[PDB]
Amino acid sequence: ADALGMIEVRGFVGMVEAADAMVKAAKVELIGYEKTGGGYVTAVVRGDVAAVKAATEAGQRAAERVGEVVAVHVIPRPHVNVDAALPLGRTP
Amino acid sequence: ADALGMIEVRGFVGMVEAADAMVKAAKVELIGYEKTGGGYVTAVVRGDVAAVKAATEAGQRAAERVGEVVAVHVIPRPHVNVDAALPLGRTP
Amino acid sequence: ADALGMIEVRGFVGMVEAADAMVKAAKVELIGYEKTGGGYVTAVVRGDVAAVKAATEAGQRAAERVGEVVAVHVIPRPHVNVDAALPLGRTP
Amino acid sequence: ADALGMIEVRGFVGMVEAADAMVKAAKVELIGYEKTGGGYVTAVVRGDVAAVKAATEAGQRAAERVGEVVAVHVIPRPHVNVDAALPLGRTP
Amino acid sequence: ADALGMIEVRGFVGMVEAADAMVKAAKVELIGYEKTGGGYVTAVVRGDVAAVKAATEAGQRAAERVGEVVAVHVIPRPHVNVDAALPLGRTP
Amino acid sequence: ADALGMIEVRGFVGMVEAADAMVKAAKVELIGYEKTGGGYVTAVVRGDVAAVKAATEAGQRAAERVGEVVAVHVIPRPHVNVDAALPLGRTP
Amino acid sequence: PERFDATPPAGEPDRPALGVLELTSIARGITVADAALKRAPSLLLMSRPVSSGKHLLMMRGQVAEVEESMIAAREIAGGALLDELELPYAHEQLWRFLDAPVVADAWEEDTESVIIVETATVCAAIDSADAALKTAPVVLRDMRLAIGIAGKAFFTLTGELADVEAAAEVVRERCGARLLELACIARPVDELRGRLFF
Amino acid sequence: PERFDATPPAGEPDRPALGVLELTSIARGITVADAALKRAPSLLLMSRPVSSGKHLLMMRGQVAEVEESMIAAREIAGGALLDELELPYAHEQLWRFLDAPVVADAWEEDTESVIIVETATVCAAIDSADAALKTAPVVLRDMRLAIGIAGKAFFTLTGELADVEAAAEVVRERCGARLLELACIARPVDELRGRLFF
Amino acid sequence: PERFDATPPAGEPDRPALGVLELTSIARGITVADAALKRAPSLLLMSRPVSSGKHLLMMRGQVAEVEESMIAAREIAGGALLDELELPYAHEQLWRFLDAPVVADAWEEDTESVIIVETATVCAAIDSADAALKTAPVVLRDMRLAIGIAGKAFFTLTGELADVEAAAEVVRERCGARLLELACIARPVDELRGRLFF
User: Fold this and answer.
1) Which of B42, C31, G119, I35 would you call most buried, defined as having the most Cβ atoms within 10 angstroms of its Cβ?
2) Which domain CATH number covers B22?
3) What Pfam families does its record include (chains G, H, I)?
C-alpha cells in the first residue's frame, strides 16, 4: 500500500539520527526499527512515495555525518505478502 | 520531551565510563543503554540541550581514554515519532 | 555506593581467569559478568577503592596471558544514577 | 541541583558590578556573596547551566573593566555534599 | 530603582572623606558602608542618576587627597535581584 | 536646591550669545547677569544638574566663537547661604 | 486568504510542500509562475512584487508536484533567479507568517530568551526559520519578508535559552553566507517583552 | 481625485496633454514644480515622493501650456532630472493608471494573450504604455509606478496575440534601453487569467 | 500614541531629552535597544524597521538618563551605527513629527516663504529641524522620516523670508555633508501654498 523507506546503519546512534531526520524532513511515519544483530540496526519509515523519497534522501545525508550507512532503499509499492510476512508496521 | 544525547561504545566498559562521566559532568538522566549486538552498546542520556551537549562532550573525552567510541551525537529536540517508536526513555 | 572494577575480555576463558585473579587478590565481590555479544564478556567486581584497584590490576596481568583484554577500568565512586540504571549488582 | 556560577573579585565594587551584569545578562538567581576576608568577595549565581554559563562569561567581562577578577568558574552539577556542606544557597 | 554609586578605599579615613564629599556635592543618600576586610571599605550612595554621577565624580577626586582609591563605579539602574540579594540599602 | 551654571565673558556680546545658547540648548532658566566692572559680565543659569551642565557646555562653545570666555563652572548643589547672600535669583 | 493554513479541511487534498522563488525581475516572475503552473498542478500561494524591485513567488502542493513545478521554474529562469527554496514539509507554525508581515503583541509568562535573525534573501529567512522550528522547541513570534525593508527579511524566535542557542546554531549553519546578523538576547528587559517593533 | 479623468465635463477646459518629471531629489522637485506653474498655467496633477528616494511630478494641460511648463522645468532641473516625458495627447485608458497602482481582478472570456513589461524609470513606462495603446487594439490592465518596488515601473497589456506582439515591438523600440524585461506570454493558464498579482 | 507629546501631564515626570539611533541592521538594533533600556531607565519611543533595510530607534527621557542610555547604546552598536543623535532638550514642534509622517494641508494667510530640505540620514534631518526651530521663528509643516523614500528624510519649514534664510544657514551648518539638497523658495505659487505633496 504505502511506500517503504529504510535506513540501515552499523550503529544505534546513526540509526536514531537517521530516523529523526526522516520524520522531520518529510511527512512520514517511523513504524519502528529492526535489530538484526552485529551492530546493524534498521529504521523503517512508511508513507507516500515522494515523501519517503525525500525522507530517505535526508536521512542518508544525516546518517553519513555521524555513522556508517550500509544500505538505503525506497520501495515505491511493496507487495501485500511483504507486509503480511515481514514486520513493516502495516501487519493486517 | 527533553533533548537527547548518546555515546556508542564497542564495549561495555567504555560505555559505563561514558555514562558515569555524562551523569557526573552535567544534569542529565541516564535512562539506560541499548545492546545492538556485536559488542556495540549505546548509553543514552536525556535532559535539556545545553547539559546534554556538555555531557556528551565530556563523555566522548572520558570514553576515548578507556575504549573505542563509535559515534557521539546530540539531538536538540527528538520528534514525537522517535520517542513513540524507538526506546528513548519517553514512551507515553 | 561501592567502588567499581571491570575487565572486558573477548572470550569467556580470559574473563574467568580475570575474575579468579580479581577475587583472589583482594576482598571484592564478583557480582557477575555482562554478555554484550560478538564474543565480548565483562567481569565486574565491586568494593572499596583500594581493593578494587588491586584486584583489577591483578586481573589485567593475569588475563593478558590467555585473552585479548579490551579494556580495564576502575570507578572509585559511581554516581547513583549509574547504579540505578545500569546492571552493576547494586540496583535498589 | 542547579548549576553554579561564581565571580570572585578582590573588592566589593567589582563584585557588585559583576553580579549586576550577571543578573541582567541571563536568567539566573543571585543567592548572595561570600566573604573570605582580605578584600575577597565572591558573588554566587545559581540556575540552569546555559544561563549561568552566559551570565558568568558576561559578569567576568564586566568586572575586568572595573576591578580585579580573581577566579570565574561554572559547575554544571555540584554534588549534594557540596550543596549541603558549603553555603551555596541551596542548603536543604 | 535608585541609581547606585560606590567608592572603595583601602582605609577608613579616605572612605569617610569620600562619603562626606558625596553627600555634600549632590542630593544623594549615604546608606552605609561595606567592610570586606583586609582594609578595603566601600561607601555606598544611592539616589537618582545625575546626583550619583556628580556625587561620585566629586567623591573620587576628594578621596584621592587622603586615601588610596581602589575602584569607583556608577550603576544607573541596578537590577531588582541585586537589591534583593546584596546589601545596598533598598532591601524590601 | 537647583544647580547653578555660569558663563563669565569679557564683553556684553559674548555674554548675551552665551545666555541665548544656554537657554536654547537645554531647559535651564537665565535668572540674570552680574556686572563686576572692567568689561567683565556674568550670565547665570539655574536648573537641574544635567541640564545646566549641557547648557554651560554649549554656551562655552558658542561664546568662544564670538568672545573671550574667562570662566565656566557648574555647581551641582549650592548651599542655601550662597543663594541667601549673593544675587543668584533664588533669594527667599 | 485561507490557502495559507497549515492543515486543510477534510474535503481537501493535503498539501505539505512549499516553494519560494525570489526573482530580480517582475516580468519573468510571471513567466516562471505560469510555466510552473503549466508543467505541474501546483497551488500558487502568492505572486507579489516586493521591495528593492523584486518578485516573490510562493507555491504550495504535494511533494512531487512542487518538485516538478520548481524544476520547471528553475529551468525557465535562466538569468534572474536571485534565490530559491524547496521544502517538502513546512513546519506548522510557519504557515501563518507568509502572506502578511505579522508582529507579536505579547509573549507568554514563561518566555526566557529571544533570538532575532535577518537574512539578505527571503528564501534564506524561510529556510532558516523552518530549520530552526524543526530542531528546537522554539516559537516563531514575528517575521518580515522584504516589504518595507527593501529585500531583506527578518524573524524572531522565543523560548528557553539553551533551545534558542541550538536554534542559533542551526540557523547559522543553514544561512551561512546569506545571514546578515543574528542577535542572541538571553534576557530581554521587562519593558520590551512582547513589544519589540513599534 | 477627479482631476485625473480622461474627458473633462462641459464646464471645463479640455486638457489633453501630459508631462512627467522624475527627479532624483525632492527639494528641487518642488523648485521644478513651482517654476513650471509660474511660467505657464499647467494644472499640476501630482507631486509625490516615491521609492528609491525620488520625486514624481505629473502636470496636465493644453499642448502649448504643458510644453512651456516643461521647458521651464527642464531648464530649472538641469543636474537632478533622472527622466522626463512630454506627451501632447495621452491615450484615454492611461488616465486612471497614474494616481493609484491599479491591479486587475478579471479580464474577459475571450482574451488571448498578456504581455508584462517593466522599465527602470516611470517616464519610460508611461511612454511605452501610451505608444502601445496608440498602435495596437490592446487593453491596459495593471500598472505600478515606482511605489513599493523601488523606482522600477511595470504594466501589463492584454489582447489578441498578434496585437500584443506588435505592441511588444513598439514598446521595445520606444524604451530601447530603459526596458528591463518584457515577456510575451501567448497563452496564460486558466489559473492565472485576470489575477496575476496577489 | 500619547508618548510623543511635548509637555507631559501633571502626574508624569518631565522628559525633555531625545535620542535617535539609526542602524544599518535590525538585529543589533534590538540589541542596542535593550542594552540602552538595561543601563539607564529611558522611555523608549520607537524601534521601527524603516526603508532601505535599516532600523530606527527613538528614546525619550531626562537629560542624564538619555545620555547614559545613548552611551551604552553607542558602545554596544560599534559596527552598524549609521548615524546617532542625542538632543538634551528637543524643540516643542518637533514632538509630533516623529511617530508618523505628517503632511500639512494648509498654511496661515501670512506665510511668506518656504524652505524644503532633505538629508541622507534621519538623525541629520531631526538635528537640523531642531536647530532651525531653535534659532528662527519658523513653523515646521511636513516631515518624512525614511519610510517610503529609502532612508532619505526631508522636512519643510515656513515663515518670513529672512527667517528662513537664517534657518537655511543653520541647517547647512548642522548637516554640512549629510545634506542632499536644500531649496529656498522665496514665494511659492498661490496654487501650491499649503498643498505640496499630493
Assistant:
1) G119
2) 3.30.70.1710
3) BMC (PF00936)
